[PDB]
From TrEMBL, chain B:
Domain of life: Bacteria
Subcellular location: Cell outer membrane
Protein name: Outer membrane protein assembly factor BamC
Organism: Escherichia coli
Gene field: bamC
Part of the whole protein covered: 26 to 90 of 344
Assembly description: Part of the Bam complex, which is composed of the outer membrane protein BamA, and four lipoproteins BamB, BamC, BamD and BamE.
General function of this protein: Part of the outer membrane protein assembly complex, which is involved in assembly and insertion of beta-barrel proteins into the outer membrane.
Family: Belongs to the BamC family.
Residues spanning the membrane: none
From TrEMBL, chain E:
Record's protein name: Outer membrane protein assembly factor BamD
Subcellular location: Cell outer membrane
Keyword annotations of the record: Cell outer membrane, Lipoprotein, Membrane, Palmitate, Signal
InterPro entries: BamD, BamD-like, TPR-like_helical_dom_sf
Single GO cellular component term: Bam protein complex
SUPFAM superfamilies for this protein: TPR-like
BP terms from Gene Ontology: Gram-negative-bacterium-type cell outer membrane assembly; protein insertion into membrane
CDD domains, per the entry: BamD (cd15830)
Length: 782, 65, 86, 370, 217
């Protein structure tokens, strides 16, 4: 019998607390059964345990020594897997970190870890830990583990394959037989379930063919214990094709026979094809889709008839129920104008059910891009026979657009130039863009503000304006004295639900003074009739321009910031009005499309192009700023600002209101003084730019996210020129009147959009010979 | 999370005292309506103590040994 | 003035049989199944109920089949009427 | 990338002492073309007439004479599903004289009797032709690692004795060869499942098992094993899946008792004189003694090929790299002097007609003699 | 993240907590807790670390730690303290922002956080009208009540603005039997009447004009 039961070193449990938590206590005879009872109670703890019980005489020294807590938190050596998944493979396997960690368990668990690596299908040469017992009771293992992967060393086999060659099939597959890296589109790496898929892949295949009598196939997956004998083998048992003739109906529903029998319109004598009935079945499902019946059920059952090779059909269409929608609850609108989120809802909550419409809701939502989660999940009232509510979880993404620049110039004050365009602004559904260049000689303005919504009819409205003191002056004059006071405002109404034809209004003034030595100015002037001087820059002009703006647009953008398989339009045109100060006409087209070569769409290709054309109404023409520029942009890359186009000429101008000596060279009083071919891009009244890309998230980048990075390579073709052009004066100088001046660049474009930080790296090689190419091979956008 | 601000006031307005207490509907004879059907039920026996964001919001500490 | 107008409609789909089916006294669950567990009700006040049917195409015409319904506390079909198409 | 592994590879060819320096090399090749396609096929010294082939639907009866190409035939069909219908070849090699009964890993089997001419009735069975074909008492023997074990007739075939043993999900590479005796044959297995058919209905007088295989306790990838046991005197000695010495001795029927020792690659016996290589690629000797051993070895671990041969009282072993490692009057000396190919070698070596036989990982034959 | 004895590291964590170095306070608090999941210093570490999460604005960390703790010991003298902190964490989950700071045009976002805070605080203050935070959570409650009233109002409003009338009538009835306290209600009531005019819902509209005259202040 015991008289003393002593404990020491528990730190959380008392001597009496331990003595009573164990059902053995003092004053009772401790036999071997009581010893084993103390031990099984130590086992019955569940997070900590130590088997030390001694009895010599009348004393129980139960040495409950706390070698825990070991928080083996250190995962060192990860190369393809996630340390969390390792903790999980421990915890679920029964190695959770509330742990005793017997010295034996060290190697045991290392080896179990490695075994799991292999269960993935792989290898791991080592799992080593550095034991870190910290000097109260706590330990951790600096788990250092090295990997041994072997991924795709395929050999492929199927037998029974006797209506089509193995490889013809093999094509379609997630799992393929060792084809060159340049052949990769999507994903191919093994796993047991990749197999399962492939299996289905072909199962489905057969069933679509219309050969009913296959199912049978075994599980022969050749394995050599050299990590490379990774080899396939399968059997099959094919079926029987028939011809489509014969059906029977059981419409278990409110009654819509006519619509369906006309839907289910198959001619007797057709050939049997499981796809055609896949069609008809879904046809009916959605022919009800408006009718609300939330949960029908069907089994179109075929009756294969031999001695005539016929298939009868047999369907059974029990319906759902009529009117459900109760509440329209969404989830994710942290600081969102969910009000707008409901503005998307043209729907009527509190009514019957139309599937098409709930689709429309969710999908046109995600049309608004900008947010990444599909959701049309419909759970009905717990406690009422009908009456669903569809929830909507999207994962949003933010908007922010803020240009930055300090300085930088020596002869210039610290410039304060910013392009600030915050759209559908966080507090509104409504968008704004403002741009101003304040750099030591320019007060350049721009206003762009919109409301997409004055009506439920959806009308978009926006004012567009500027007041430009872009002087470009040396000090004050003979130096492009210009004041451009220009405006416009926007309205919006598409009715094809996807097609808009536009019409908008605006105004511009421009003040002109202090001409520059470029003849084309004079050309516009004289074509207008005004005859200015030519050795002198003496002339000054104004305009007041009452602008109408009609256009067209179509849109199908299948994601947001990284939209997919897009088909988008923006057409525009201009004609002059009664009572303004300028006359001309223009027409232009634009076209860019996505094409995803991947169907996981981890790889998408693009086709992009644009257009441009300017011409004058009677006797008059298209002013200059209206002409097309290009270079170093998301129209052309590899160059400097507005580089693509013709170039300009100076006429002998040695007194241009002090034609500045040592300045404004090439027919300046100091330098050249006669006719001058001058070097400066000018652009033309006609343009078009076409390119191609390929969305390409490389394996080398940690492809943990598909949202901040889209990676592609560009091709380009470039030439900008004037139409109403002659050589009669462009004889002694280069001539620009037809598309012949081809340009090209090639280069990589990197994109990783951090919420607040862009690092737009894109090196490009302009590779197409044309004169005056003033190149720039480092372009950082924002 | 602060710019020399935000110690004994919430981020933005507080309508705690501004919260409309029961401006009861006093129904005409037989013109009554179910007066409550949700959890929105407070013991009017409360306080008056730490009212509004001006209170001992710091975690009550607990004795040492 | 838009040359065309879309169409908007609300629940309670009804037909001539949907209405000719039910009859006086016919209880809550009876007419419920017969027509649907409706939504056009009285929360406070008598046991009176309604069926209306509204459908509006392209600036033209109107559907309003406003069926009034009345039960008692226990619930008995009584004192019912519709004005189809207003 | 995936070739960044620092496992311990072939330990090098040792000192090259050979008073017997490889004294012939009669070379000859189909030039094909074996490649990394894994199997064990082999030229067959049929009356010193070696009927040889390669993995393209090739065959030509050379002669173990310096090998003169006779009976040269191509092996494919050109109608139907494809032109030449690409034949890939991993069905074992055997004859009965001219009766070269051969299968293809295309589950397609050819009892070509190059004795009655081009009589090779094709054969499309459950499971593919994977093992080397045997004949028991005038009946073709069948081990497809199919789980199902068919049987057929010579020169006509008819499905029979079609036994269905155990397959695992993993579907490892294992197959097995039947060792005929006592009105039955002795084939190996892959899950330790050792239930050996007395071909009576195809009747296993058997259900005992080697408790050892992979599939649940997957362990190291170096226990590659010859799954084929061998009759002696009524005793059969076996090579269980993972490292297992054993004698579950058939005693007119089966009397089982495991004399364990790990590290299995492949073996040979001479009465008591048991010889073998360990699964780490090291070579011991032994006697039928419960697992009492001989011949310590440490230096040729992880060599490419470890498939041995002896004739004229001098053992021989080779890896790939065309290196040849010679053995002997056995120890004190085991040393290695040759590197005879670059294609290298990975199959069974054979020593027939007082000669020696082996295929090069590509290109047919370079007949080295001591 | 040092390895000091529990007293010294805990005291440094406490003084940097009060300091406002709740970032580094959290660093050393998580240090201590990951060191030892036992001992009352670990439990007070759990309390101070949930406070420091909610202070340094680690609300996900806060909620994780605190639900972990309520799973640890769901009964304690601090249960009121716990439910308090949790309702508040839901609160700052609901409306902490830059416009959540400016305070113009708010109280109409995801009330899931608000549902959580309401349930937490209401069921707490009924389970515990007995605390020095009792009336505080009470103000939080009537506050957030009228707050969600604004939410649902702006909702219902917008809805009928769509010309959407009947579902709104229903929503009204919903909040009505739900909670007849806020002014938003009486605001909504005219709108109801107007809807009744839309479909020409006569008798009920008359009824409701009377009963608002009955309630309308």
């Amino acid at each position: 019998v015991v008289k003393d039961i002593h404990f020491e070193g528990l730190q959380r449990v008392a001597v009496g607390a331990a003595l009573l938590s164990m059902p053995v206590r003092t004053g009772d005879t401790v036999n071997d059964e009581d010893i084993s009872n103390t031990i099984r109670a130590l086992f019955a703890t569940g997070n900590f345990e130590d088997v030390r019980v001694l009895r010599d005489g009348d004393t129980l020294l139960v040495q409950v020594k706390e070698r825990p807590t070991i928080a083996s938190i250190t995962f060192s050596g990860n190369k393809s897997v996630k340390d969390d998944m390792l903790k999980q493979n421990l915890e679920a396997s029964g190695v959770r970190v509330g742990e005793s960690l017997d010295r034996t368990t060290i190697a045991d668990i290392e080896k179990g870890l490695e075994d799991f690596y292999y269960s993935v299908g792989k290898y791991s040469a080592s799992v080593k830990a550095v034991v870190t017992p910290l000097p109260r009771n706590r330990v951790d293992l600096k788990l250092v583990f090295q990997e041994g992967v072997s991924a795709e060393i395929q050999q492929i086999n199927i037998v029974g394959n006797h209506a089509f060659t193995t490889d013809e099939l093999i094509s379609h597959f997630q799992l393929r037989d060792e084809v060159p890296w340049w052949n990769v589109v999507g994903d191919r790496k093994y796993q047991k379930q990749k197999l399962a898929g492939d299996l289905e892949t072909l199962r489905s295949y057969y069933l679509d063919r219309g050969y009913a009598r296959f199912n049978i196939d075994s599980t022969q997956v050749s394995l050599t214990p050299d990590k490379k004998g990774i080899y396939v083998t399968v059997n099959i048992t094919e079926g029987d094709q028939y011809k489509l003739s014969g059906v029977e109906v059981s419409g278990n529903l409110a009654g819509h026979s006519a619509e369906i029998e006309q839907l289910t319109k198959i001619e007797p004598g057709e050939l049997y094809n499981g796809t055609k009935v896949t069609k008809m079945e879904d046809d009916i499902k959605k022919l009800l889709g408006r009718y609300g019946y939330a949960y029908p059920r069907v089994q179109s059952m075929p009756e294969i008839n031999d001695a005539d090779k016929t298939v009868k059909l047999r369907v059974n269409v029990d319906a759902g129920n009529r009117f459900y929608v109760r509440k329209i609850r969404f989830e994710g609108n942290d600081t969102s104008k969910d009000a707008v989120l409901r503005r998307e809802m043209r729907q009527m909550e509190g009514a019957w059910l139309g599937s098409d419409l709930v689709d429309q809701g969710k999908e046109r939502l995600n049309r608004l891009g900008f947010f990444e989660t599909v959701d049309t999940d419909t759970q009905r009232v717990p406690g009422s026979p009908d009456q669903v509510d569809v929830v909507y979880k999207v994962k949003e993404r933010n908007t922010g657009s803020f240009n930055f620049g300090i300085g930088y110039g020596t002869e210039s004050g610290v410039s304060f130039q910013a392009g600030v365009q915050q759209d559908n602004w966080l507090g509104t559904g409504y968008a704004v863009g403002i741009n101003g260049t304040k750099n030591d000689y320019q007060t350049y303005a721009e206003l762009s503000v919109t409301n997409p919504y004055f009506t439920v009819d959806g009308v978009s409205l926006g004012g567009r304006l500027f007041y430009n003191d872009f002087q470009a002056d040396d000090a004050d004059l003979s130096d492009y004295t210009n004041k451009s006071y220009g405006t416009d405002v926007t309205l919006g109404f598409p009715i094809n639900e996807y097609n808009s034809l536009r019409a908008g209004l605006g105004y511009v003034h421009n003040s002109l003074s202090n001409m520059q030595p470029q003849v084309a100015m004079w050309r516009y002037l004289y074509s207008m009739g005004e005859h200015p001087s030519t050795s002198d820059q003496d002339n000054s002009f104004k305009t007041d321009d009452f602008t109408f703006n009609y256009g067209w647009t179509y849109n199908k953008l299948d994601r947001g910031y990284f939209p997919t398989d897009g088909s988008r339009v923006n057409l525009t045109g201009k004609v002059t009005i009664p009572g303004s100060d300028n006359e001309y006409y223009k027409v232009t087209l634009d076209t860019a499309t996505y094409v995803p070569i991947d169907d996981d769409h981890k790889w998408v290709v693009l086709g992009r192009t644009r257009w441009g054309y300017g011409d004058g109404l009677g006797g008059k023409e298209m002013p200059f700023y209206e002409n097309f520029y290009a270079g170093g942009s998301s129209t052309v890359r590899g160059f400097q600002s507005n580089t693509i186009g013709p170039k300009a000429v100076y006429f002998p101008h040695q007194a241009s209101n002090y034609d500045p000596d040592y300045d404004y060279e090439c027919a300046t009083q100091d330098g050249a003084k006669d006719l001058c071919k001058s070097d400066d891009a000018v652009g033309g009244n006609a343009m078009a730019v076409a390119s191609l890309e390929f969305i390409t998230p490389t394996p080398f980048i940690s492809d943990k996210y598909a949202n901040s990075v889209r990676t592609s390579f560009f091709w380009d073709m470039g030439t900008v020129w004037d139409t109403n052009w002659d050589s009669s004066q462009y004889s002694g100088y280069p001539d620009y009147s037809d598309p012949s001046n081809i340009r090209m660049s090639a280069g990589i474009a990197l994109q990783w959009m951090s919420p607040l930080g862009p690092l737009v790296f894109s090196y490009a090689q302009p590779f197409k010979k044309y004169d005056g190419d003033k190149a720039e091979q480092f372009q950082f956008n924002i | 999370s602060s710019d020399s601000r935000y110690k004994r006031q919430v981020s933005g307005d507080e309508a705690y005292l501004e919260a409309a207490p029961l401006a009861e509907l006093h129904a005409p004879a037989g013109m009554i309506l179910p007066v409550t059907s949700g959890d929105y039920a407070i013991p009017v026996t409360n306080g008056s103590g730490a009212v509004g964001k001006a209170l001992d919001i710091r975690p009550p500490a607990q004795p040492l040994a | 003035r838009v040359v065309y107008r879309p169409d908007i409609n609300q629940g309670n789909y009804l037909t001539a049989n949907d209405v000719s089916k039910i009859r006086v006294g016919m209880t809550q669950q009876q007419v419920a199944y017969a027509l649907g567990t409706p939504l056009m009700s009285d929360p406070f006040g008598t046991n009176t109920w309604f069926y209306v049917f509204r459908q509006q195409p392209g600036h033209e015409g109107v559907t309003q089949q406003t069926l009034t319904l009345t039960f008692n506390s226990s619930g008995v079909l009584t004192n019912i009427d519709n004005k189809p198409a207003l | 990338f995936n070739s960044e592994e620092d496992v311990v590879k072939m330990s090098p060819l040792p000192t090259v002492e050979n008073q017997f320096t490889p004294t012939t090399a009669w070379s000859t090749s189909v030039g094909s073309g074996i490649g990394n396609f894994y199997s064990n096929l082999h030229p067959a010294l049929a009356d010193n007439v070696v009927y040889a082939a390669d993995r393209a639907g090739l065959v030509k009866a050379l002669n173990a004479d310096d090998g003169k190409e006779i009976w040269s035939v191509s092996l494919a069909e050109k109608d139907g599903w494809f032109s030449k219908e690409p034949a890939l070849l991993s069905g074992g090699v055997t004859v009965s004289g001219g009766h070269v009964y051969i299968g293809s890993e295309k589950a397609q089997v050819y009892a070509l009797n190059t004795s009655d001419g081009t009589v090779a009735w094709q054969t499309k069975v459950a499971g593919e032709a994977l093992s080397r074909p045997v004949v028991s008492d005038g009946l073709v023997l069948i081990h497809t690692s199919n789980g199902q074990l068919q049987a057929l007739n010579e020169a006509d075939g008819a499905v029979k004795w079609t036994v269905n043993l155990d397959m695992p999900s993993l579907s490892l590479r294992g197959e097995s060869a039947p060792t005929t005796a006592f009105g039955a044959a002795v084939v190996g297995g892959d899950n330790g499942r050792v239930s050996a058919v007395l071909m009576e209905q195809g009747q296993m007088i058997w259900q005992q098992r080697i408790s050892q295989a992979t599939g649940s306790t997957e362990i190291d990838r170096l226990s590659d094993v010859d799954t084929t046991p061998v009759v002696v005197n009524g005793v059969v000695f076996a090579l269980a899946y993972n490292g297992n010495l054993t004698a579950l001795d058939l005693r007119s029927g089966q009397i089982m008792w495991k004399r364990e020792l790990g590290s299995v690659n492949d073996f040979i016996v001479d009465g008591n004189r048991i010889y073998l290589v360990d699964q780490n690629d090291r070579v011991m000797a032994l006697t039928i003694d419960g697992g009492v051993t001989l011949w310590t070895q440490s230096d040729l671990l992880h060599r490419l090929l470890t498939s041995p041969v002896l004739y004229n009282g001098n053992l021989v072993v080779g890896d790939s790299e065309g290196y040849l490692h010679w053995i002997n009057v056995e120890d004190g000396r085991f040393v290695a002097q040759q590197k005879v190919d670059s294609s290298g070698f990975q199959t069974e070596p054979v020593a027939a007609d007082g000669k020696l036989l082996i295929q090069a990982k590509d290109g047919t034959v370079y007949s080295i003699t001591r | 993240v040092p390895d000091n004895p529990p007293n010294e590291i805990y005291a440094t964590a406490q003084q940097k907590l009060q300091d406002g170095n709740w970032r580094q306070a959290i660093t050393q608090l998580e240090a201590l807790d990951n060191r030892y999941p036992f001992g009352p210093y670990s439990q007070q570490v759990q309390l101070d670390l949930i406070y420091a999460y909610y202070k340094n604005a680690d609300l996900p960390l806060a909620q994780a730690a605190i639900d972990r703790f309520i799973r640890l010991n769901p009964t304690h003298p601090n249960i009121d303290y716990v439910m308090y902190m949790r309702g508040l964490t839901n609160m700052a989950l609901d409306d902490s922002a830059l416009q959540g700071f400016f305070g113009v045009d708010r109280s109409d976002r995801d009330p899931q956080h608000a549902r959580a805070a309401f349930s937490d605080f209401s069921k707490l203050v009924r389970g515990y009208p007995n605390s020095q935070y009792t009336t505080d959570a009470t103000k939080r409650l009537v506050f957030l009540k009228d707050r969600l009233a604004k939410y649902e109002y702006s909702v219902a409003e917008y809805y009928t603005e769509r010309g959407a009338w009947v579902a709104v009538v229903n929503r009204v009835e919903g909040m009505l039997r739900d909670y007849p306290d806020t002014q938003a209600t009486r605001d909504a009531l005219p709108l109801m009447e107007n809807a009744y005019r839309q479909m020409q819902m006569n008798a009920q509209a008359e009824k409701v004009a009377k009963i608002i005259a009955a309630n309308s202040s």
